[PDB]
Amino acid sequence: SNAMADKIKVGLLGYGYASKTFHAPLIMGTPGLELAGVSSSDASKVHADWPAIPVVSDPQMLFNDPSIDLIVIPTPNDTHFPLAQSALAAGKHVVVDKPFTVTLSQANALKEHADDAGLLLSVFHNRRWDSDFLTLKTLLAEGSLGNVVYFESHFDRYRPEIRQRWREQGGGIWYDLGPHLLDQALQLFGLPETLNVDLGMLRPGSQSVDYFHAVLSYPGQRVVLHSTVLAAAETARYIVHGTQGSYIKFGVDPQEDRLKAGERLPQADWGYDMRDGIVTLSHDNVLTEKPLLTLPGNYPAYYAGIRDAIWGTAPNPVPATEAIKVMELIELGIASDQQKKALPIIAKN
Ligand SMILES: [Cl-]
């Protein structure tokens, strides 16, 4: 179908931080997609941003609307499955935010129910479109670092004050940030042989996990995923070592802040990351170095991808299949931490 002359009507569920910050602005900015309606308690909270405000007070009404094609579910973690089921039952396509589901049993159920009903089911791993990650994918594809042997990925922050993330996730940031990092690691290197996770609470007053250090092990490779809320000094986002060179990048992707600030698509300079990383290469037993041009972040690619998948033009940007694998590693991290062991990944096709 045409993204010029045809529209996929979308139903958004609730107006939480996610709907407000990501889903609304991004669906709105995507040609071919039309945000038909949003279910919410306080429409006034919505209209302040997006009137027309075809607001409804109950998600089941959107499910009812027969013209609606797609349903996005960024509500509280525990509602995902119910709402998701209801949605697939109503014969509607579904995008679920993270965490996918409270249970693997649930996730797979949706994967099946959605597959039998010929509907599209996808999860919002938007960070596959972070400026740094895109740039990196391209660097590896070109092979200048040689054979990659080490990958280090951090989201280190400094918030010593205990008032940020209500409520809890036991959580804590492993549930909140793990999925993003794990998914990237899988996308770049596939499945590891073992996962070893060390969860922590280093901040006095923390109620949930506020620290995690994960090691994913591969034949001749190591991947280190790390986060913390007690890092006053800025640390590298990525550190990548190959047999021929290295790549170190600082900063985070800049889209989230600009969306928070209320910016609407399109922007001449959407996603520009002016904080370039640096490549170091060994040419003739000499180490040279230069900055690597950072590709702009591109979250919109997700919904444009969803659009195109609905119309059957292209592959689901993020299959449930892949979300479920990340979810499995999230649980395996918990187990690994409980046993203080590097646990093996199992049960592959
Ligand atoms: Cl080894």
Side-chain angles (χ1 to χ4, degrees):
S1 306
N2 270 16
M4 215 74 188
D6 209 25
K7 272 167 167 289
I8 295 170
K9 304 192 76 185
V10 184
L12 180 60
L13 272 42
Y15 208 87
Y17 172 88
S19 289
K20 153 113 160 57
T21 303
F22 297 102
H23 307 292
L26 281 172
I27 303 182
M28 209 64 283
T30 296
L33 296 183
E34 166 182 310
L35 180 61
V38 183
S39 58
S40 176
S41 290
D42 184 5
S44 172
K45 157 89 167 178
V46 170
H47 320 135
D49 284 320
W50 297 110
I53 36 56
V55 159
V56 305
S57 75
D58 174 40
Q60 182 60 67
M61 299 178 180
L62 296 174
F63 300 109
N64 284 176
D65 190 337
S67 63
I68 282 189
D69 306 316
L70 168 54
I71 292 293
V72 315
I73 302 165
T75 50
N77 319 8
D78 43 357
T79 61
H80 285 194
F81 182 71
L83 299 180
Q85 281 278 122
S86 294
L88 291 174
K92 286 166 188 173
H93 299 278
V94 175
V95 166
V96 185
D97 208 333
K98 299 177 303 306
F100 189 20
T101 280
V102 177
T103 276
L104 288 172
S105 163
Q106 291 180 154
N108 286 293
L110 298 176
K111 161 68 181 72
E112 296 176 17
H113 174 193
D115 216 308
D116 303 351
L119 300 161
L120 169 143
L121 178 56
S122 175
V123 180
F124 188 61
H125 283 298
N126 60 298
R127 293 206 179 258
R128 288 190 192 180
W129 289 277
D130 269 359
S131 57
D132 41 45
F133 187 70
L134 291 168
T135 302
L136 180 57
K137 281 181 61 177
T138 309
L139 175 68
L140 303 179
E142 302 189 6
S144 55
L145 304 177
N147 308 121
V148 173
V149 302
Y150 189 78
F151 177 66
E152 185 163 350
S153 177
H154 289 234
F155 266 143
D156 302 338
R157 302 155 160 174
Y158 188 69
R159 50 211 59 204
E161 73 283 307
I162 326 154
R163 60 178 316 170
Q164 298 289 9
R165 156 77 183 173
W166 281 83
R167 178 184 192 172
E168 57 171 332
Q169 62 189 27
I173 71 167
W174 170 246
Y175 281 140
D176 189 41
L177 295 169
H180 290 304
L181 281 26
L182 281 169
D183 182 56
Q184 290 185 165
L186 272 45
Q187 290 300 301
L188 294 168
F189 307 105
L191 288 166
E193 293 190 308
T194 66
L195 168 71
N196 192 4
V197 174
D198 169 37
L199 298 183
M201 281 188 36
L202 274 25
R203 177 182 50 191
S206 281
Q207 287 298 328
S208 339
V209 179
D210 72 23
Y211 168 96
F212 80 70
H213 189 255
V215 175
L216 291 62
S217 202
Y218 303 74
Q221 297 184 118
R222 300 300 137 95
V223 165
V224 173
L225 317 181
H226 185 119
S227 196
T228 183
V229 297
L230 285 183
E234 192 147 23
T235 61
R237 169 76 191 94
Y238 293 144
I239 292 168
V240 189
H241 297 310
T243 54
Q244 303 269 35
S246 305
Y247 178 68
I248 294 90
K249 169 143 210 311
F250 279 79
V252 299
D253 174 291
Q255 306 176 73
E256 190 170 24
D257 281 313
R258 291 174 59 180
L259 290 175
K260 267 158 52 61
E263 295 200 24
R264 311 271 188 89
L265 277 46
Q267 292 290 165
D269 60 358
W270 188 253
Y272 276 54
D273 186 345
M274 300 307 305
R275 190 166 186 187
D276 289 345
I278 289 165
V279 179
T280 303
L281 304 177
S282 191
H283 177 246
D284 280 334
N285 291 8
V286 160
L287 297 179
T288 344
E289 73 176 40
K290 37 173 292 182
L292 172 71
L293 179 73
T294 302
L295 302 183
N298 191 23
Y299 287 157
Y302 177 79
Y303 275 100
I306 296 285
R307 177 194 67 207
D308 292 347
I310 299 301
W311 290 335
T313 327
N316 187 334
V318 172
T321 271
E322 287 173 341
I324 296 169
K325 267 142 61 187
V326 172
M327 218 164 145
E328 286 175 27
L329 294 193
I330 291 286
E331 286 202 0
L332 198 54
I334 302 291
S336 156
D337 177 70
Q338 294 167 168
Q339 307 174 29
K340 315 309 299 178
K341 263 214 67 155
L343 291 168
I345 287 66
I346 329 164
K348 305 179 302 299
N349 288 298

